[PDB]
């Protein structure tokens, strides 16, 4: 269900593995800083938040550097979908490998291609929302387009127009914006860090409709950002500089984490400790995501607690994942789920039944088809 083949040269192979492993080390920092927040009430600390954000930036920067020539991998498959085909058909093409990395757990396909065994569970995720120093959809689009030049490598260097004032970046290139995208921007103006599930719920749309595809010719927030970003000239000089500085920046972040953690823990959070206890860190990080997911399902979607916990556990604490799953499939993992509950969390199911008058079975058949298609 996750697959990719590396097809470049020996030299490129070493380049890709080095990039990937640095990305892993950066993401480990994202995890470890979150871990400290959750383990220690007193840490739950402004310079710790800043460390976390810096690790988010570096993880994104390394991710932008995957498959620089956009030809180093083939047969990229993510949750059973052929991403080679998907990306080739996009007006702007690009790297199927980097495209995969932006999907939750997409790293699995790339880790396999590169035969990464240097570190246990060598994850790279680039889907931070609430604590992302950049507007989150923009951040994901920079990664997709390999914009090592545009991705900041330090929190102090993040331009307001890539965050709170993101509208200025949109306005500068005078791209077309459709009605749906305008509705989405209205919500982002209130809070640029609004989760995509919440934008969808508030607009009465599916998450898929909110996002669209990561190409200018689609429609949705990914589409609008893509339309903007492809107009921004590549800055090789700044790219080179980010690449030169980031390895050192990453080491410094670890040293700072170590020193900061001493104010809260008996045993300092060293890089060594983090690697050795990576499983425990991932366990805690996941259980929190589950709790948060279940609470959202109860408080925003009117789903009973036990049902909510069941779905949260079965689906990686991802609302977006639950929201796109066929009723019969949700019902198979959580038997107590009601149709009304499923219609609440899956807007596509609700629409197909309510507006098109389809049976749940017919709706499920289509929902399953939509799973393979970006933007519906």
Give 176-234 as a 3 state SS string.
CCCHHHHHHHHHHHHCCCCCHHHHHHHHCCCHHHHHCCCCCCCCCHHHHHHHHHCCCCC
Give the residue before each break in the chain, using a C-to-N cut-off of over 2.5 angstroms; say none if it is continuous: 44
Question: How far from each other are the two terminal CA atoms of the chain, in whole angstroms?
Answer: 21
Note whether 101 and 67 are within 8 A (CB): no
Both 205 and 107 in one domain: the answer is: yes
Q: How was this structure determined?
A: X-ray
Note whether 319 and 305 are within 8 A (CB): no
Element (H, E) at 365: helix 360-370
Both 14 and 110 in one domain: the answer is: yes
- Residue 88: name the closest of 76, 78, 80, 79 by CA: 76
Note whether 94 and 87 are within 8 A (CB): yes
Both 289 and 356 in one domain: the answer is: no
Both 348 and 373 in one domain: the answer is: yes
> How far is 292 from 294, CA to CA, in rounded Å?
6
Q: Does 265 show up as a binding residue in the annotation? A: yes
Both 256 and 274 in one domain: the answer is: no
186 CA to centre of own chain: 22
Domain containing residue 368: CATH number: 1.10.150.740
Residue range of the domain that includes 136: 1-264
Domain containing residue 279: CATH number: 6.10.250.950
Both 49 and 176 in one domain: the answer is: yes
User: Which pairing describes strands 2-6 and 81-82: parallel, antiparallel, or unpaired?
Assistant: unpaired
Q: What are phi and psi of 329, to 5 degrees?
A: -80, -45
In the chain, DSSP assigns E strands to 2-6, 73-78, 81-82
> How far is 202 from 184, CA to CA, in rounded Å?
10
What DSSP line would sit under 237-285, residue for residue? HHHHHHHHHHHHHHHHHHHHHHHHHTTT-SS---HHHHHHTHHHHHHHH
- Boundary (domain end) residue, out of 236, 264, 292: 264
Both 278 and 361 in one domain: the answer is: no
Both 34 and 183 in one domain: the answer is: yes
Both 153 and 50 in one domain: the answer is: yes
Q: Does 125 show up as a binding residue in the annotation? A: no
> How far is 308 from 291, CA to CA, in rounded Å?
9
358 CA to centre of own chain: 33
Note whether 63 and 101 are within 8 A (CB): yes
Our count of domains for the chain comes to: 3
Both 234 and 284 in one domain: the answer is: no
CA dihedral 197, 295, 107, 55 (to 10 degrees): 100
Both 118 and 208 in one domain: the answer is: yes
| Per-residue b or e along 223-249, where b marks 16 or more CB atoms closer than 10 Å to that residue's CB | bbbbbbbbeeeeeeeebeebbeebeeb
CB atoms within 10 A of CB 71: 13
> How far is 136 from 353, CA to CA, in rounded Å?
32
Both 291 and 329 in one domain: the answer is: no
For CA atoms 228, 230, 236, 240, the dihedral sign is: positive
DSSP 344: H
Length, in residues, of the chain: 376
């Amino acid at each position: 269900v996750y697959d990719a083949e590396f097809v470049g040269s020996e030299r490129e192979f070493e380049e890709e593995r080095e990039t990937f492993l640095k990305g892993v080390k950066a993401y480990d920092g994202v995890l470890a800083t979150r871990y400290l927040m959750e383990r220690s009430s007193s840490a739950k600390d402004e310079e710790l938040l800043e460390l976390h954000q810096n690790f988010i930036l570096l993880t994104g920067s390394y991710a932008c550097s995957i498959d620089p020539t956009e030809d180093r991998y083939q047969n990229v498959i993510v949750r059973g979908v052929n991403f080679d085909e998907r990306v080739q058909r996009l007006s702007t093409g690009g790297s199927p490998a980097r495209y995969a990395i932006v999907y939750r757990r997409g790293w699995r396909a790339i880790a396999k291609a590169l035969d990464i065994d240097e570190e246990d569970v060598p994850a790279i995720e680039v889907r931070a929302v609430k604590r992302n120093p950049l507007q989150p959809a923009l951040y994901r689009i920079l990664v997709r387009y390999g914009r090592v030049d545009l991705m900041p490598v330090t929190v102090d260097e993040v331009p307001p127009e890539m965050a709170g004032e993101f509208e200025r970046l949109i306005e500068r290139y005078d791209v077309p914006i459709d009605e749906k995208e305008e509705r989405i921007l209205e919500i982002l103006r209130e809070n640029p860090w609004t989760p995509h599930d919440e934008i969808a719920r508030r607009l009465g749309l599916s998450v898929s409709e909110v996002e669209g595809e990561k190409d200018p010719e689609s429609s949705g927030i990914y589409s609008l950002w893509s339309r903007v970003v492809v107009n921004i000239e590549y800055d090789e000089r700044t790219a080179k500089r980010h690449v030169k500085r980031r390895d050192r920046l990453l080491e410094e972040l670890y040293e700072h984490l170590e020193e900061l953690s001493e104010r809260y823990l008996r045993h300092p959070l060293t890089r060594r400790w983090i690697v050795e206890h990576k499983r425990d860190i991932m366990r805690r990080y996941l259980e929190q995501r589950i709790v948060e997911c279940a609470l959202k399902l109860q408080d925003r979607y009117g789903i009973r607690e036990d049902v909510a916990l069941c779905l949260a556990r079965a689906f990686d604490g991802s609302i977006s994942m639950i929201a796109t799953t066929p009723y019969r499939t949700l019902k198979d993992v959580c038997p107590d789920l009601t149709l009304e509950e499923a219609k609440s969390v899956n807007r596509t199911l609700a629409t197909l039944i309510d507006e098109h008058g389809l049976s749940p079975d017919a709706a499920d058949e289509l929902i399953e088809h939509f799973e393979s298609i970006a933007g519906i």
